[PDB]
RNA sequence: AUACAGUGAAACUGCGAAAAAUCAGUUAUCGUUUAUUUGAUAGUUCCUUUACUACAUGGUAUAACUGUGGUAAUUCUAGAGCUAAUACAUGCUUAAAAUCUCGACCCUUUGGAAGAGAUGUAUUUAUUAGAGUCUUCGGACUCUUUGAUGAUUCAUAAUAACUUUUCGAAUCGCAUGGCCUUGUGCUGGCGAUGGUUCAUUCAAAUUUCUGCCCUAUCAACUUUCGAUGGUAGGAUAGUGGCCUACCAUGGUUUCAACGGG
């Protein structure tokens, strides 16, 4: 158990969206790991009032360390994506009344909200996002104006 | 009858004996009978007609002799796109039959099968069974995301659970029902809906005032969510047909109801409280008569 | 093959989880008793 | 300023709620350091992110407790200290002179003077030379 | 199978072959235990080899705190008792003035329990407080007064706990390790430092005002009515030569 | 002994074969693994169940074996058919649950209770919590609700989900006992293995600083192809340029860095 090499490293697995697959890998010591290769479908989570929901993936849009990984879409920890907003649109709905914040009003009814990735899938096994809403809503509306 | 469906799987002649078979499968060892002689079937115009309605069965549920095998759900499937746009739906519908992409893509024949086959495949999987609880809320996160749905839902349930007595005024059976109303209600054809629900809680109450702690249970989980489920909606004819004999044995009792009660009185629902009259008995019989008595008030 | 052994070895599995359950639910009860008492000290 | 990078600064697990109102606009976090090290109001309300900081950050300090005094600040977000301790080997028969030096993490809640003696805590690794952390001056 | 450099306060015999018994995983550590083959091949001499030794713990002869630990290398530290059901001899094996492994001749009524330091005091699973002790016998629901370095009565019949001696400034202790072994009497001083390095300072029939670290260390009872027997003379370390000077 | 029973070839299985450079110590792991031993550890898998159900317990897929050969040798082999499990892969656990509140009412309580309500673990997130009198003179009258650390975003609980899935015993040797509904009926002991999580144990891993020869006709070394830091990520049992991007241009040194034996 737990020797020691010099230097060398390994290949990651830089995931993609579409033909989600799981490959797990043998961890010394416990917790064998999940690597996700090509991952569609993730867990996304509103932060205000506190809802989960499984949701299709749409896109990356933006990447704060490599600008290569939005064109070759890829999901790492800490990405801006574009979901479906459909099942929290229901329970907004649902549980609120308003059937319909400013800002995520505002992108209802355009379609597809922004939200942050927290796992790393990569190493973890599975894709969680949280719907950014609030100062960090304000940094990226601010993030896309450095898009655009 | 196990070496006979073999030898029927190993097979004019056949199609009359398939005929002779529809009459049987119309009227009902036989589990694994059953699911040789549907794997033969699966590879007439009036007893098709007949078989397209009991395979559609067999692929929205599995109610009677099991509870939703997903081989039985499997087989029903096969036999439904052997008898029966056409192709995506079949290919998401037997992806479904295999749930969590297929939910996420599927998110109108082809969608009274979707919601047959989704509901059959998360038939109340068990209650917790660590995989149950992310089925049950994966089937009401569908129902929800999919009115056609909704109302073949509670057709469903009304298929499952004579209603001019029922609407009036088997215990393992109704124990059964009452669970399924409760796992209906569990949702987050409303008149239909609403009278068997009624129907299947009077049953329960006349059943429990004459296996007794699951009527009980079934009872009460039944009326807190009618309770939720008028909250929820807010019609006073059925409304009171329904609450009259109800309340009129809950009489003495309410010295769930009382918070129907409380909610159920708060200008239209004034009216229809004031329909029926007892309210302060309620209010005399605590923090619990305190926020009644000074909501009410 | 059901022998009578097989199912006197579950009978004796169901009744010791429910020893043991049942033993546990007691020494729970217990300190929740001790702790009333060091509350009322 | 408080942004500096491509990324926004995060402090996660503790975020602030847009429904509710206060006049903090996140629930700061701030930990006391130990061994008598009193995090100070400068630290506490500067809105400066530190994910490595021994009072805000996620590190805390333990152990070893040495002396120096600054040499450089010529490094991003990171300071190097001199040691010259008094140093006798007995082919020498005299009080020698050496000095020992390495680098130690700064944070952006304290002012920084080349000369002045700071108090420098042991922690956990923070670069590949960076193993220690100041916690007071 | 490294050896020939064992804790020294075992005294082994020199030659006696290369090795020197290695204790297994168990309740005590490495250095601060005596298994079961240097008890009852070198110590007392009941076996006079290894696989007899073998024998006699095969036979269920030998139990440690209540039940047999059928065992050869098992590494049986401080403070337990060795029930010998025969012989009707009931070893605790505590220290002595000089740092090696004293055995006692218990009766059974004391022998029927055991105490033990604990280490550490915490809620384990579902809000449920647990407490553990030197020998790993992590124990549920205290009572809640425990602190940490303070010392539990088990019953040894089942584990619960029937007193607890709640340390302060001033009841009956005892030491274990470094070089103030076996010593009793927990009154002059009571430092605390932050990070160790502190004593309850000791006072005996010399009253000598002594200190070790608080890792070892660890309570009896009260002052001249003590839980457990102590042995030749409650052992105080005088002098030698004022032993040979007055007797 | 018409399932076998103690004996045991062979084989499957289980386990174990893992010249500040070295180090001698020291510090932490509130920066990781924690196998083996030891101690506590878990009622929840079907209820669109009466045209009522695998649990008195369900399935393959093969060794050894039998048979056909090759071959020049044997620690070489290919084909075929059998047959097992703590191997492999599934899988339901019968007052369908069961337990604690509130216990109004009675009858006097140490109750027995009609019905108002809740109930695993693991994984990955996002939170939240985690900080002066009355006095039968006897006592009471409401009191200020939380574990530890020097230190936490610790331990832990709840909240809303996701689980390609976790576990929640399809196992084994000895005795055969108590009951009465005499039925292959209900229950029952000693303890071998396996498994969830925590602690302990040893074992591994880094990391802290104190310490070794001769040298300046040895003073500059390193950013190349990250040399020195920050920020985010990849990774990894794990911190950490260990690597990937963007920013900054550093760091070591004459007290002998760097080189020479």
Same mark, same amino acid.
């Given at each position: 158990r737990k020797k020691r090499k010099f230097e060398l490293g390994r290949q990651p697995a830089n995931t993609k969206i579409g033909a989600k697959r799981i490959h797990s890998v043998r961890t010394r010591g416990g917790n064998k790991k999940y690597r996700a290769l090509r991952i569609e479908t993730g867990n996304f989570s509103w932060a205000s009032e506190g809802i989960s929901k499984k949701t299709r993936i749409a896109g990356v849009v933006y990447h704060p360390s490599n600008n290569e990984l939005v064109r070759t879409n890829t999901l790492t920890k800490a990405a801006i994506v574009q979901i479906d907003a459909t099942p929290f649109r229901q329970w907004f709905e649902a549980h609120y009344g308003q059937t319909l914040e400013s800002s995520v009003e505002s992108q209802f009814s355009a379609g597809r909200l922004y939200a942050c990735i927290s796992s790393r899938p990569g190493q973890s096994g599975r894709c969680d996002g949280y719907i950014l809403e609030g100062e960090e809503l304000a940094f990226y509306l601010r993030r896309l104006t450095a898009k655009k | 009858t196990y070496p006979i469906l073999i030898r029927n799987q190993a097979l004019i002649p056949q199609v009359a004996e398939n005929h002779f078979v529809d009459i049987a499968p119309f009227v009902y060892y036989k589990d694994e009978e059953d699911m040789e002689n549907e794997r033969v079937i699966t590879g007439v115009d009036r007893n098709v007609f007949l078989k397209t309605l009991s395979k559609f069965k067999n692929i929205k549920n599995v109610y009677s002799a099991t509870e939703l095998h997903d081989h039985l759900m499997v087989l029903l499937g096969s036999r439904n796109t052997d008898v029966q746009l056409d192709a995506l739906?079949?290919?998401?519908?037997?992806?479904?039959?295999?749930?969590?992409?297929?939910?996420?893509?599927?998110? #109108?024949?082809?969608? /009274?099968?979707?919601?047959?086959?989704? #509901?059959?495949?998360?038939?109340?999987?068990?209650?917790?069974?660590?995989?149950? @609880? !992310? +089925?049950?809320?994966?089937?009401?996160? +569908?129902?929800?995301?999919?009115?056609?749905?909704?109302?073949?839902? %509670?057709?469903?349930?009304?298929?499952?659970?004579?209603?001019?007595?029922?609407?009036?005024?088997?215990?393992?059976?109704?124990?059964?029902? @009452?669970?399924?109303?409760?796992?209906? $209600? =569990?949702?987050?054809?409303?008149?239909?809906?609403?009278?068997?629900?009624?129907?299947? +809680?009077?049953? $329960?109450?006349?059943? !429990?005032? !004459?296996?007794?702690?699951?009527?009980?249970? @079934?009872?009460?989980?039944?009326?807190?969510? /009618? /309770?939720?489920?008028?909250?929820?909606?807010? =019609?006073?004819?059925? %409304?009171?047909?329904?609450?009259?004999? #109800?309340?009129?044995?809950?009489?003495?009792?309410?010295?769930?109801?009382?918070?129907?009660?409380?909610?159920?009185?708060?200008?239209?629902?004034?009216?229809?409280?004031?329909? /029926? %009259?007892?309210?302060?008995?309620?209010?005399?019989? +605590?923090?619990?008569? #305190?926020?009644? $008595?000074?909501? $009410?008030? | 093959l059901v022998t009578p052994q097989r199912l006197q070895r579950k009978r004796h599995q169901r009744a010791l989880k429910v020893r043991n359950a049942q033993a546990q639910r007691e020494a729970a009860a217990e300190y929740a008793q001790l702790l009333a008492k060091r509350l009322s000290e | 300023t408080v942004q500096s990078e491509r990324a926004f600064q995060k402090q996660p697990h503790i975020f602030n709620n847009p429904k509710v109102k206060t006049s903090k606009r996140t629930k700061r976090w701030y930990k006391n350091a130990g061994l008598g090290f009193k995090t100070p109001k400068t630290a506490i309300e500067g809105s400066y992110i530190d994910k490595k900081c021994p009072f805000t950050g996620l590190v805390s300090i333990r152990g070893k407790i040495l002396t120096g005094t600054v040499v450089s600040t010529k490094m991003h977000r990171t300071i190097v200290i001199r040691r010259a301790y008094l140093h006798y080997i007995p082919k020498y028969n005299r009080y020698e002179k050496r000095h020992k030096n390495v680098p130690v993490h700064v944070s952006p809640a304290f002012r920084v003077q080349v000369g002045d003696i700071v108090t420098v805590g042991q922690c956990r690794p923070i670069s590949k030379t960076v193993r220690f952390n100041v916690v007071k001056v | 199978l490294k050896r020939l450099a064992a804790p020294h306060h075992w005294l082994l015999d020199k030659l006696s072959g290369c090795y020197a018994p290695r204790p297994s995983a168990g309740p005590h550590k490495l250095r601060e235990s005596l298994p079961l083959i240097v008890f009852l091949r070198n110590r007392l001499k009941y076996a006079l080899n290894g696989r007899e030794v073998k024998a006699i713990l095969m036979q269920r002869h030998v139990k440690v705190d209540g039940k047999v630990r059928t065992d050869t290398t098992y590494p049986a530290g401080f403070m337990d008792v060795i029930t010998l059901d025969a012989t009707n001899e009931n070893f605790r094996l505590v220290y002595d003035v000089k740092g090696r492994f004293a055995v006692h001749r218990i009766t059974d009524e004391e022998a029927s329990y055991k105490l033990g330091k604990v280490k550490k005091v915490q809620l384990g699973k579902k809000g449920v407080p647990y407490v553990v002790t030197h020998d790993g016998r992590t124990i549920r629901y205290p009572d809640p007064n425990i602190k940490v370095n303070d010392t539990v009565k088990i019953d040894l019949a089942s584990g619960k706990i029937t007193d607890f001696i709640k340390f302060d400034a001033g009841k009956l202790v005892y030491v274990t390790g470094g070089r103030n072994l076996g010593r009793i009497g927990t009154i002059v001083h009571k430092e605390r430092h932050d990070g160790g390095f502190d004593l309850v300072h000791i006072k005996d029939s010399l009253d000598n005002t002594f200190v070790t670290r608080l890792n070892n260390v660890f309570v009896i009872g009260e002052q001249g009515k003590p839980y457990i027997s102590l042995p030749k003379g409650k052992g105080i370390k005088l002098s030698i030569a004022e032993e040979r000077d007055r007797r």
């Open positions: - | 739906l079949a290919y998401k519908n037997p992806t479904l039959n295999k749930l969590l992409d297929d939910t996420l893509f599927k998110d #109108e024949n082809g969608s /009274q099968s979707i919601k047959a086959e989704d #509901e059959k495949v998360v038939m109340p999987y068990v209650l917790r069974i660590f995989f149950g @609880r !992310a +089925q049950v809320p994966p089937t009401s996160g +569908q129902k929800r995301s999919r009115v056609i749905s909704v109302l073949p839902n %509670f057709k469903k349930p009304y298929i499952n659970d004579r209603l001019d007595y029922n609407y009036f005024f088997k215990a393992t059976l109704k124990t059964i029902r @009452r669970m399924t109303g409760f796992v209906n $209600i =569990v949702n987050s054809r409303t008149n239909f809906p609403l009278h068997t629900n009624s129907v299947l +809680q009077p049953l $329960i109450y006349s059943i !429990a005032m !004459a296996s007794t702690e699951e009527v009980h249970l @079934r009872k009460m989980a039944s009326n807190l969510r /009618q /309770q939720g489920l008028k909250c929820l909606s807010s =019609v006073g004819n059925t %409304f009171d047909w329904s609450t009259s004999m #109800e309340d009129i044995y809950a009489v003495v009792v309410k010295p769930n109801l009382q918070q129907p009660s409380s909610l159920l009185r708060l200008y239209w629902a004034h009216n229809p409280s004031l329909y /029926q %009259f007892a309210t302060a008995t309620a209010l005399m019989d +605590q923090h619990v008569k #305190e926020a009644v $008595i000074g909501p $009410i008030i | - | - | -």
